[PDB]
Design a binder for these strands. Structure first.
Lengths: 192, 126, 182, 79, 64, 136
RNA sequence: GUUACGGCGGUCCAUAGCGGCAGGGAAACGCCCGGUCCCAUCCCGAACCCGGAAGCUAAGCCUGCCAGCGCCGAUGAUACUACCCAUCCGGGUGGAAAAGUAGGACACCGCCGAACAC
């Protein structure tokens, strides 16, 4: 897991409020917050294009090697604040990180699926809770569904992991449900 | 790996006592010129206090543990009687004549009542 | 200055045997019967308000104490039942009177049931409280069994500080309830 | 072809009448209320209709006593 | 337990009429429900009750 | 048809058409969703028309979720009656739909057919809308 | 003054609760023995009450541990909003949530009494 923590120039904020924040978003930045066991909550402005490149590249949970005030820092993206319509990025929380730490994480699965003909898939869940190392978070829990038949409830305690990564969502979950496929006459009797 | 099931009557009796004592306490008040006479009973011995509930402070005290009160020979009731004597003397030294009587979550009669009646006899106004 | 049979027996043998069986640290953990309970649901309260008095008289003659008359706190009209209609009598038994009652029951009446094969070991609950039931009162020689005008059965239940069914059955065995030994 | 509704009941002028800080005489009415939304504390009394009133002059303090909003009266400083 | 009197309470001797393995003990069974023959089985004398049947005369788990 | 089996209060005010969505701004159970952009009241018959539009365009197998239910009535009153004299009776049932909100979610393999189906179901509704993938 | 003690109280009353683990009984808190005397059960000395100290810290209770069931909870952003600008849209100065997050927390404080001591 040879990750390249993306680098980003961030500058501390003068003004902290709604007017300033809208002016910032307008200019083309994104406000952001930094905290953790740093215990010194910093308020930053990132640049949205660079931030979006970083996310689109390495998934949403993606470590960062920031540059604050000339000094550099290490952070993880804990939470995003998105707009529904425009689908901008309004605000970003950032958890400081030392190397070798155990922080809980929530990543996305990937259904690589080609099934039997009489088969349909149903993704009951996207997001699974994990603890891992700092530099070693995945991007995609690949789950494969091929050769299988009708009902095969892929439990959560069935996915293949890295070495040194732990599942913390309960192993009861239906991540997938392989339904007996519908009839064209069954599609008349669903939601009427 | 033996394990119990539920409530013992010690717990029942205790929490019921606290229940009815803090029921009663709604009507009783405290003040340094009219304090509250709390009683706290056990099977063996007994304890009492004069309480000021304006500051949750205490002005007098007594109990049937002190050897000078164990120097009684007679019944539990007589221990209680001499206790009432001592607290009358002490209260009227520290400067309290009138009080109320909190039965502390116990029934009136027996040792409580004989205490209080000895105190009424020996001067306290209640 | 007196001792009932079952209680002397209890303090002599049974505590010892349960100690030698279950190996408690404190003897306070030893199981001990507390009380005995009796109930009679008349059920025809809305049709005979006089069988109630009959049952009261029977349990009086049987237990030597005036029962309690349990009222109906709820009103369920599918049975005619209304708030306060007396449906049943109930008696509590504690102490020497209890031990005497168990002596009599085990030694006179239960050896007078018709084709008594055995009381189940499965009338327990959670920890060992034995809740059985009698169809008729035609059995206690205590009763004047000439005057009875109807069957008026009852329901008995025996409660103990035992913590589980194994200790309960073992104790009641040592005390001499005719379980179905299985 | 009728609207069988239409009725209503005239008011009763409930609520707080002497808020925090004010000076109140004796027997004055702090709050009118149906239930004990606000309970009495010290130097305060209850009515028949669960009204509250003052028993001793002073000034108000809407504090809580074990989860329940109370009303109190404190001693003014004599001039 | 108390006034509003209960039935009366006196001892009893349940004389085993099966094989002579009798019983005798304090009870609430007396004027209420007792039999004649005040036979002292002990230091005192108190009523007796013929025992038509019992345990040691009733084949069951405790008896054959 | 979609209706509730019983409502407590069967004569309600008109819902509000002010504000943006708080929930249902994220595809949940399928792959290809519909998202609104305007404010509107969507009824029972519209949603029936739309689900039928989808099932007659996939026709075999592939699932359809409806994250809306008409649980707020509206009151017509009978015809040619002067205003006044009460409040009419409920006749059709709407769901309010604030912008950002998601209505439908499909699960069919090929995006071609799926996008086309959702478009046919969009043209059965009063709102401007758009199509969504579960991705960011 | 002080210890794994008891009792009465308080906190704008769960930061204090529930559950699990270990552990304590000197004087005290207790449980327990029995209904002679006051007194009591809508029946029962079970409870309340009385008379004592054979027995055990098993339980109650107190002490430490477990952040797991529950609770508390920010900064910053957002929603909403007062006022103003603005031909519909939208915007600026100020105020500012809920949720979420980081985290916290197996309470704190006061008085008398004991035991312990110079």
């Amino acid at each position: 897991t040879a990750n390249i923590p993306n680098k980003l120039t961030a500058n501390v904020r003068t003004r902290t409020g709604k007017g300033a924040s809208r002016q910032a978003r307008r200019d083309g930045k994104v406000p952001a917050v930094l905290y953790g066991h740093g215990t010194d909550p910093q308020h930053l402005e990132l640049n949205a294009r660079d931030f979006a490149a970083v996310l689109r590249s390495h998934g949403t949970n993606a470590i960062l090697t920031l540059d604050i005030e000339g000094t550099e820092q290490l952070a993880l993206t804990k939470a995003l604040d998105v707009h529904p319509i425009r689908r901008n990025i309004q605000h970003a929380d950032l958890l400081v990180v030392q190397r070798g730490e155990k922080v809980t994480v929530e990543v996305t699965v990937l259904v690589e699926g080609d099934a039997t003909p009489g088969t349909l898939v149903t993704q009951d869940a996207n997001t699974i809770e994990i603890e891992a190392e700092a530099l070693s978070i995945p991007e995609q829990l690949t789950v494969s569904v091929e050769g299988v038949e009708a009902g095969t409830q892929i439990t959560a305690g069935q996915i293949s992991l890295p070495e040194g990564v732990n599942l913390i969502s309960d192993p009861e979950l239906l991540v997938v449900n392989v339904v007996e496929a519908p009839s064209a006459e069954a599609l008349e009797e669903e939601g009427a | 790996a033996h394990k119990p099931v539920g409530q013992n009557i010690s717990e029942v009796r205790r929490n019921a006592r606290l229940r009815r004592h803090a029921r009663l306490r709604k009507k009783v008040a405290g003040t340094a010129e009219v304090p509250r006479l709390v009683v706290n009973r056990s099977a063996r011995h007994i304890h009492v206090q004069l309480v000021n509930d304006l500051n949750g402070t205490t002005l007098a005290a007594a109990s049937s543990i002190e050897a000078d009160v164990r120097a009684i020979d007679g019944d539990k009731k007589a221990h209680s009687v001499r206790v009432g004597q001592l607290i009358a003397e002490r209260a009227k030294a520290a400067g309290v004549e009138t009080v109320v009587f909190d039965r502390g979550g116990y029934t009136y009669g027996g040792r409580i009542a004989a205490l209080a009646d000895a105190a009424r006899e020996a001067g306290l106004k209640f | 200055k007196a001792l009932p049979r079952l209680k002397q027996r209890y303090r002599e043998e049974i505590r010892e045997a349960l100690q030698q069986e279950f190996n408690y640290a404190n003897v306070m953990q030893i199981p001990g019967v507390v009380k005995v309970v009796v109930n009679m649901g008349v059920g025809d309260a809305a049709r005979d308000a006089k069988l109630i008095n009959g049952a009261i008289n029977d349990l009086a003659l049987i237990t030597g104490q005036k029962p309690e008359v349990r009222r109906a706190r709820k009103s369920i009209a599918q049975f005619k039942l209304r708030e306060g209609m007396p449906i049943g009598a109930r008696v509590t038994l504690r102490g020497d009177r209890m031990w005497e009652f168990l002596d009599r029951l085990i030694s006179i009446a239960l050896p007078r049931i018709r084709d008594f094969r055995g009381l189940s070991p499965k009338q327990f609950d959670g920890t060992g409280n034995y809740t059985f039931g009698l169809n008729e009162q035609s059995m206690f020689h205590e009763i004047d069994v000439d005057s009875i005008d109807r069957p008026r059965g009852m329901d008995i239940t025996v409660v103990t500080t035992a913590t589980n069914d194994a200790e309960g059955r073992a104790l009641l065995r040592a005390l001499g309830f005719p379980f179905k030994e299985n | 072809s009728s609207s069988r509704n239409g009725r209503d009941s005239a008011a009763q002028r409930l609520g707080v009448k002497r808020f925090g800080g004010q000076v109140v005489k004796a027997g004055e009415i702090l709050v009118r209320q149906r239930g004990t939304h606000f309970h009495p504390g010290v130097n305060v009394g209850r009515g028949g209709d669960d009204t509250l009133f003052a028993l001793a002059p002073g000034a108000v303090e809407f504090g809580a006593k074990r989860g329940r909003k109370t009303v109190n009266i404190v001693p003014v400083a004599r001039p | 337990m108390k006034p509003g009197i209960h039935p009366d309470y006196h001892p009893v001797v349940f004389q085993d009429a099966a094989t002579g393995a009798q019983f005798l003990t304090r009870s609430t069974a007396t004027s209420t429900r007792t039999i004649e023959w005040p036979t002292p089985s002990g230091p005192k004398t108190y009523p007796l009750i013929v025992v038509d049947v019992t345990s040691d005369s009733h084949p069951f788990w405790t008896g054959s | 048809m979609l209706i509730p089996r019983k409502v407590k209060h069967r004569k309600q005010h008109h819902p509000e058409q002010r504000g943006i969505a708080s929930g249902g701004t994220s595809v949940s159970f399928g792959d290809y969703g519909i998202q609104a952009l305007e404010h509107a009241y969507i009824t029972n018959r519209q949603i029936e028309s739309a689900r039928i539009a989808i099932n007659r365009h996939i026709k075999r197998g592939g699932k359809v979720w409806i994250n809306i239910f008409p649980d707020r009535p509206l009151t017509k009153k009978p015809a040619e009656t002067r205003m006044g004299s009460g409040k009419g009776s409920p006749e059709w049932w709407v769901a309010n739909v604030k912008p950002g909100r998601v209505l439908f979610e499909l699960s069919y393999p090929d995006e071609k057919t799926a996008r086309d189906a959702l478009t046919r179901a969009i043209h059965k509704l009063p709102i401007k809308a758009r199509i969504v993938t579960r991705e960011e």
